[PDB]
Amino acid sequence: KFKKPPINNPSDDATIKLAEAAVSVSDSMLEMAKVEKVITPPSKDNTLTIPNAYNLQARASVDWSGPIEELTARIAKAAHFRFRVLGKSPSVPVLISISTKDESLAEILRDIDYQAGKKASIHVYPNSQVVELRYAKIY
Amino acid sequence: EVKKQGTSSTRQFRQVSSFNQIVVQGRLNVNLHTGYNKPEVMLRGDPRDLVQVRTIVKQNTLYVSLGQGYPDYGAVTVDIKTKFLNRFRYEGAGVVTGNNLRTSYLDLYLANEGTTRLAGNIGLQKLEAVGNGVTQINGVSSRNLQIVLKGDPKVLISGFVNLRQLDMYGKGTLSLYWIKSDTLTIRAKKAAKIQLAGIVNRLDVELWDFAQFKGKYLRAQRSFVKTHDKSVAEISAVNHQSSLATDASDIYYYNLSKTRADFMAFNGSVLDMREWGQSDLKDFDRYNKQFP
Amino acid sequence: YSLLNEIAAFLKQFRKIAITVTSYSSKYVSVKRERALTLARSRVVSEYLWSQGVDSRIIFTQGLGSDKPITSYTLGGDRSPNARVEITFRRAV
Amino acid sequence: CFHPPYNNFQPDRRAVKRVGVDTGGGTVGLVASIYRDSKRKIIRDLQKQDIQYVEYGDTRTLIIPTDKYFMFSSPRLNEICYPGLNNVIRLLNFYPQSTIYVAGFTDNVGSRSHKRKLSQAQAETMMTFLWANGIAAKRLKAEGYGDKNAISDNAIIHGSAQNRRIEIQWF
Amino acid sequence: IIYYIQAVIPGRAWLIGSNGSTLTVREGSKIPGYGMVKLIDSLQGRILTSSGQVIKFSQ
């Protein structure tokens, strides 16, 4: 008998076409990210703004596709920290999309802070046990 | 066969020929010195037993032991000065002190409670302790060393050691301060205490029962660790970690390696055992996330 | 895994946002070993629960060691009633 | 009996259970044991699962698909497919003197460092699983290549699926 | 030049430099380019200097 190892479930041509589009999207993003990193080298990291402490090492798996404030409040309530909001919330809402699996709350907050970008910022004060969300001075 | 009664400890100076190996037996004390003068030996002892204290030389050796049997002698002090040393043998519940010794290669053989101090720069390739003795060596610079123990020694070595293999079957405790090796193979059988620190390219650890390996502060690029029943290993792997715990044994790591692989058989357990409050703690990646 | 499948089949019947998994154990050697053991146990349990198809948004995991016992009878090991895993949630609407 | 998670890394006593259950014949049980313990029966069992065996000259090679023997985008070993791993250990037990080379290969999707790290992690995981079953550490070496030397075309779906593999070679 | 710690013990530490030269450092000792050592940490790989910087492990 002659056989070759990978014999999976039968495939659909719609999924085949979506995969063929997604590979080209992926390596276009890879080339653009490489060019962007070469032109602009970053020099600072948000570890200074968001440090870790005890009871920030409890872990979480999250799949969230909504606004930032409710998710940040849930993370702060699970981390047993007070929650503070600074600035005016914009009329067009700040939307985030997180889909992770089994990582620490400090890493969750850092990914949320990086995905927020120029609209909002996350700060953590462990001596006062405060998680702070501040909105940008725009509009 | 005469005793030592009626005679107190008196000073004696004697002359000896050239020797390159010392074999000392008896409940006595040895002091070692090093100079560029002639060799000599001083024998502080009772004048009834100064004849019984034997200083004989046979083929570039020195045999300081009991003469005409051992009826009784209590206190003997042997101070020694020479140029070249290549072998040292000590037996019989005694004290050895030496410092500032320069050599290329020599061998220690301590037996039956030799309380020993060496405070020099001795490059030694072999060393043996028989049992129930302590040893404190400050400064060893050798390109090779092989240590095997069979009794109950309590031995600590300072310096720079390129160790290659280690086997223990007795009740020994051994601690080395700094090592720089390439491949270490450690086997512990009955009840062993090993304390190492330094740089090791590849490490293999086998623990059978009631054995504790504290390989913390010993950073290994490649680690293979196997623990059987009621043994404890504490490792510090850096690049690749491979561990197996069989039954009621504990393996602990203290660094997040680039590749981790752990296995459990009956009741063994591999635990993280980190601080949780360190300001520069590192999280798992896509390539490290293994769920026990 | 059959008991975990039964727990997952019970959990699929509700609508929820966040689940919390908390682990408690007993005193064996020290506090670091038991906190690490409870965190690893909660991680493995929530990993299998998230692998199965529960329709939740967030799952939180913590291991408290032996800080909060529910029974003053502490003679057993893992057979003690205060060595346990707890799954808490709130039914939404 | 048999414990499904790797039988606690113990050598299984497969023959005595069969010759104890086939008595109520001893000769019939011995014939069945010497048939099912043969090398060709192990090769055909590995043919029943999705593992390929190639022999050419004095070198033997096993091809194992990561899509079924690993969890998705992880160096974790899939515990459901344990009969294939046990048959791999049973086949490798017949050559107690040779040296083992294990290599990891992925497809073209992703970054170069990501492909290299995933292949290296899968190769180390498979080497550790080989080491934990009795094989000494001095006979093992693991290496992870990316999309360097593929065996099929990466511009087609089935050919790209055939490229993600683990190679085990011995003499 | 810059220094990284190679191995650590309670009491003293082993350092390696950019040029490949080894060094042994005490609690109270002087090293070039950093100043005076005031603290040696064993649980974490940190050596605090008088200039206001920390020698840590390599990355």
Side-chain angles (χ1 to χ4, degrees):
Chain A
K1 300 298 291 294
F2 300 97
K3 280 183 48 169
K4 296 182 198 195
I7 303 161
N8 296 336
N9 287 123
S11 309
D12 204 72
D13 64 325
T15 313
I16 293 171
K17 291 167 173 173
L18 289 163
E20 293 179 353
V23 169
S24 314
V25 170
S26 81
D27 63 358
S28 286
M29 294 299 291
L30 204 62
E31 293 179 353
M32 171 278 264
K34 176 196 293 314
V35 163
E36 183 178 1
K37 168 102 171 68
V38 168
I39 298 298
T40 44
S43 52
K44 266 180 192 324
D45 195 14
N46 61 347
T47 288
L48 294 174
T49 46
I50 307 161
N52 63 6
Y54 208 91
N55 68 55
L56 266 190
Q57 293 297 135
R59 300 188 91 82
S61 47
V62 57
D63 170 42
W64 188 278
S65 185
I68 184 175
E69 178 155 332
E70 184 178 359
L71 183 68
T72 309
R74 290 236 184 206
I75 293 298
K77 194 191 172 229
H80 295 286
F81 273 29
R82 214 147 76 249
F83 185 50
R84 201 145 69 205
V85 189
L86 271 66
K88 314 178 187 187
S89 167
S91 193
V92 178
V94 178
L95 301 170
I96 54 174
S97 183
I98 306 279
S99 198
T100 61
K101 189 178 107 172
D102 195 75
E103 76 176 349
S104 67
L105 295 180
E107 289 296 349
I108 292 289
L109 285 171
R110 280 171 202 146
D111 303 336
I112 290 168
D113 186 21
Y114 274 135
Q115 191 169 154
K118 287 230 171 273
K119 308 188 187 187
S121 291
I122 304 280
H123 295 255
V124 165
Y125 306 98
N127 281 346
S128 173
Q129 292 183 100
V130 166
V131 178
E132 195 193 77
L133 182 62
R134 59 182 69 181
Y135 291 106
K137 304 185 205 166
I138 208 63
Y139 298 117
Chain B
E1 293 200 5
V2 287
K3 51 172 168 45
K4 62 98 176 179
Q5 202 57 47
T7 43
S8 186
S9 183
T10 62
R11 190 68 167 159
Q12 186 194 8
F13 315 100
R14 217 188 277 192
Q15 297 302 288
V16 65
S17 50
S18 187
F19 58 95
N20 276 351
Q21 154 184 351
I22 320 180
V23 180
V24 184
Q25 187 153 352
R27 188 219 285 277
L28 61 83
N29 319 304
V30 191
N31 291 321
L32 282 85
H33 284 271
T34 300
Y36 54 89
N37 322 113
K38 304 177 286 295
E40 70 275 16
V41 58
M42 283 73 74
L43 302 165
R44 201 204 277 272
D46 311 336
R48 189 72 182 272
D49 267 346
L50 290 177
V51 186
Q52 268 55 52
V53 168
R54 181 206 300 211
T55 311
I56 206 167
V57 164
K58 193 254 161 189
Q59 286 182 353
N60 195 0
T61 67
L62 183 51
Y63 289 7
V64 180
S65 55
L66 60 85
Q68 315 304 287
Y70 160 59
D72 195 67
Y73 55 89
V76 162
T77 299
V78 183
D79 193 13
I80 196 157
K81 288 195 73 79
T82 175
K83 177 61 72 76
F84 287 111
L85 289 189
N86 297 115
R87 197 173 296 275
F88 182 76
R89 318 280 306 262
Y90 201 62
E91 284 185 356
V95 183
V96 170
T97 310
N99 63 6
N100 312 288
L101 188 153
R102 291 154 157 85
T103 192
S104 169
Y105 158 66
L106 60 84
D107 207 335
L108 277 296
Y109 193 93
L110 274 299
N112 297 296
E113 209 295 328
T115 307
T116 318
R117 281 82 65 193
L118 278 74
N121 62 6
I122 297 89
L124 61 84
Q125 188 274 331
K126 270 282 191 161
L127 188 152
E128 279 305 305
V130 166
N132 274 277
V134 302
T135 312
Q136 188 274 331
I137 303 167
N138 190 359
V140 163
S141 284
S142 79
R143 263 180 298 162
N144 211 320
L145 182 45
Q146 162 88 40
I147 303 168
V148 55
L149 308 179
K150 51 215 186 307
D152 287 30
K154 276 83 179 172
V155 59
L156 63 86
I157 307 166
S158 171
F160 283 91
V161 163
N162 200 301
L163 210 68
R164 188 90 52 109
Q165 215 176 44
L166 196 149
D167 291 331
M168 292 180 183
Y169 320 113
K171 305 283 292 297
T173 74
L174 162 65
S175 89
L176 285 82
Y177 278 171
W178 305 121
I179 61 171
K180 186 186 201 98
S181 176
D182 179 74
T183 294
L184 265 178
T185 292
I186 319 292
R187 255 71 180 153
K189 183 62 69 177
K190 204 67 90 185
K193 280 167 182 78
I194 302 107
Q195 196 151 14
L196 316 173
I199 298 317
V200 162
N201 261 317
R202 184 176 179 179
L203 180 77
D204 209 331
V205 169
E206 182 66 26
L207 309 185
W208 281 100
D209 61 340
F210 279 120
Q212 296 183 333
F213 177 61
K214 324 276 196 70
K216 196 173 56 186
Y217 320 114
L218 178 61
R219 299 184 70 84
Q221 307 274 333
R222 308 286 310 249
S223 69
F224 296 89
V225 170
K226 197 165 298 196
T227 62
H228 295 265
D229 56 355
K230 299 209 195 47
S231 46
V232 162
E234 324 200 335
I235 72 174
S236 188
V238 176
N239 262 322
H240 303 273
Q241 177 202 309
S242 166
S243 53
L244 172 61
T246 316
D247 60 357
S249 54
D250 270 26
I251 311 180
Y252 311 129
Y253 48 93
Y254 287 90
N255 198 57
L256 197 42
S257 74
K258 288 186 202 147
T259 288
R260 171 165 61 98
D262 310 319
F263 285 98
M264 293 179 184
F266 276 103
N267 269 346
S269 46
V270 193
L271 277 297
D272 209 315
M273 302 288 314
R274 278 185 291 155
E275 294 294 328
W276 299 6
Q278 201 175 310
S279 56
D280 66 38
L281 203 74
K282 208 197 254 176
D283 209 30
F284 301 126
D285 291 331
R286 193 164 283 274
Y287 302 102
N288 282 317
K289 211 168 285 175
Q290 306 255 13
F291 290 94
Chain C
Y1 283 115
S2 57
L3 178 82
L4 287 184
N5 283 331
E6 274 155 32
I7 289 154
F10 179 65
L11 272 173
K12 294 181 176 67
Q13 298 278 295
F14 304 96
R15 215 169 264 176
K16 68 194 79 65
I17 302 166
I19 319 179
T20 310
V21 175
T22 308
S23 290
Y24 307 92
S25 79
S26 163
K27 310 198 154 133
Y28 189 43
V29 167
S30 44
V31 295
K32 284 195 62 78
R33 186 267 183 275
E34 64 187 2
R35 293 181 184 271
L37 168 70
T38 45
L39 184 60
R41 284 178 145 148
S42 74
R43 275 180 76 230
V44 170
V45 163
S46 69
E47 208 280 305
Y48 189 70
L49 283 176
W50 186 271
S51 173
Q52 304 303 107
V54 289
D55 208 12
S56 173
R57 315 262 70 80
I58 321 167
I59 293 187
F60 291 114
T61 62
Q62 43 178 12
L64 266 295
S66 53
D67 276 335
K68 185 177 180 180
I70 51 151
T71 304
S72 49
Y73 180 75
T74 74
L75 277 296
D78 290 333
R79 256 73 191 171
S80 196
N82 63 6
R84 66 214 186 268
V85 285
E86 281 185 335
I87 299 159
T88 72
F89 67 100
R90 161 168 294 193
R91 186 181 194 183
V93 161
Chain D
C1 289
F2 190 80
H3 289 286
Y6 320 117
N7 210 48
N8 309 94
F9 298 109
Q10 304 272 77
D12 53 352
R13 309 302 297 143
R14 185 177 178 180
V16 291
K17 288 190 82 78
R18 295 183 185 274
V19 308
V21 73
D22 189 74
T23 195
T27 53
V28 177
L30 277 186
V31 161
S33 173
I34 204 67
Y35 175 41
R36 298 243 160 175
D37 276 332
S38 57
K39 199 178 115 172
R40 295 179 66 250
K41 192 77 197 142
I42 291 176
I43 289 173
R44 293 179 293 173
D45 271 322
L46 285 163
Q47 183 62 255
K48 298 293 183 182
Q49 292 83 18
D50 291 331
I51 294 178
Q52 206 196 9
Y53 169 74
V54 169
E55 180 191 324
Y56 180 50
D58 84 350
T59 311
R60 280 101 174 165
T61 306
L62 279 169
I63 299 174
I64 298 165
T66 75
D67 274 335
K68 292 183 183 292
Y69 282 88
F70 279 83
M71 296 195 91
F72 170 72
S73 296
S74 75
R76 297 175 59 214
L77 192 64
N78 188 26
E79 268 167 8
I80 298 170
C81 279
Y82 68 95
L85 304 156
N86 294 338
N87 278 333
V88 159
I89 300 300
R90 270 197 268 277
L91 181 70
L92 269 176
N93 268 343
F94 272 105
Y95 307 92
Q97 318 288 333
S98 56
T99 70
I100 308 297
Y101 296 94
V102 288
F105 299 93
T106 69
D107 70 356
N108 68 303
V109 180
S111 169
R112 183 177 292 171
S113 57
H114 158 74
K115 288 180 275 209
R116 177 186 46 89
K117 279 184 245 188
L118 190 50
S119 302
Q120 192 72 246
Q122 281 167 356
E124 295 298 290
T125 299
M126 174 78 60
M127 182 179 72
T128 295
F129 182 71
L130 289 198
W131 164 83
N133 263 277
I135 301 178
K138 48 188 187 53
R139 305 167 50 204
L140 295 160
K141 202 201 180 225
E143 173 83 2
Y145 309 89
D147 46 342
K148 208 66 68 194
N149 55 5
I151 53 172
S152 309
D153 196 2
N154 274 328
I156 57 173
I157 291 290
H158 193 231
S160 200
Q162 290 180 315
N163 274 324
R164 310 182 282 256
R165 69 206 194 262
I166 295 283
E167 294 293 328
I168 304 182
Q169 291 181 356
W170 67 97
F171 300 147
Chain E
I1 62 170
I2 192 166
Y3 280 97
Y4 314 121
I5 190 167
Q6 187 147 33
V8 72
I9 201 67
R12 65 179 64 88
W14 185 14
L15 299 168
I16 193 66
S18 291
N19 45 3
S21 63
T22 61
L23 188 152
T24 305
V25 65
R26 298 293 296 163
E27 170 46 73
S29 84
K30 192 245 187 179
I31 62 170
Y34 286 89
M36 185 64 72
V37 173
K38 65 178 72 66
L39 188 153
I40 292 184
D41 199 6
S42 173
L43 276 74
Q44 315 158 358
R46 284 174 174 176
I47 303 295
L48 282 72
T49 69
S50 81
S51 57
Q53 51 191 352
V54 185
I55 319 166
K56 307 161 95 71
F57 278 107
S58 197
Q59 300 278 12

